[PDB]
Symmetry: C3
Subunit: 126 residues, 3 copies
């Protein structure tokens, strides 16, 4: 497995498409991605129009508000745990000659919900 | 594409399209894991129940409440942010077991292309491992 | 070609199946596929050692997917569970090294039950 280091903001979708492809070495086949974290996730979504990620983050904040009196996990990041579960922490994608095989408007994002930090993303070719 | 089958699936404005048989038809009797992917950002892939039509009905109804089309705060002018969210929540890929061309699923499971912004003709890629 | 785990579950909760999966690996190294042949439970990787994380996850999911929704047409009444299942997902792909699942120090593998109590199956396959 190849380990990528990805600095992240307090909250946001970090495009890691190029960093991943940089670890493919001309690979044509499947690519496994995994984040060994519980308060961030991985997703494939549109990046071309920056307002898409804006609305995704905004809407997720409404489904998973930071403020919840009933929360028992007082450290305060239960909202991030929920966002991570909803998004997912692993991906499996296809690549062609070192490039991720994605749709017209797709980019690979490390969705940070509890940063800022330097997150790790594991990459494995198969 | 080489080694990857491209299925093209017609979809309604919104709904769960059962693509179980169409995926199986692309397996050529394969035995092993099967990878599925939609190269789209406003639809998804999920494994759910089709036997009772109301399951899909309630899923779409509830997803609309979680991701309403109408949101003044949206910055994405095109107006489909709701579909982008439903897609993110559902997921855009699946990995399933197949035996001699048939998907191995639970008694109440079917493979669905979850359309949130149609009607369209979506693509679904199939890769045999 | 797959190993089946029989996992007991409560009415609802995150059942840690990390050790059960590893026992079935018998020292295997490589990618491992997990799948639940069910539509009202799911599979996810989350923090386990702290009981409050799972509690808040279940609490918030119940708020996002209420059990009693007037508009529901699925009379059986478990559409909330079907939704939670769809939102969580029903399969996982994880790396294993010498029989141990490669995970972050605070991650555990969970069968997320939303409509128990019952016994769920988890299919395991070595790639």
């Amino acid at each position: 497995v190849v380990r990528l280091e990805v600095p992240t903001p307090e909250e946001g979708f970090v495009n890691i498409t190029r960093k991943v492809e940089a670890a493919l070495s001309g690979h044509t086949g499947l690519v496994y991605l995994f984040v060994p974290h519980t308060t961030c996730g991985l997703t494939v979504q549109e990046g071309a129009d920056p307002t898409v990620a804006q609305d995704l983050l905004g809407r997720l904040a409404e489904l998973a508000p930071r403020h919840r009196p009933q929360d028992r996990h007082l450290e305060g990041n239960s909202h991030a745990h929920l966002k991570s579960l909803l998004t997912g922490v692993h991906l499996l994608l296809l690549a062609e000659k070192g490039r991720l095989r994605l749709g017209r408007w797709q980019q690979v994002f490390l969705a940070e919900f509890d940063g800022p930090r330097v997150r790790e993303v594991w990459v494995r070719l198969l």
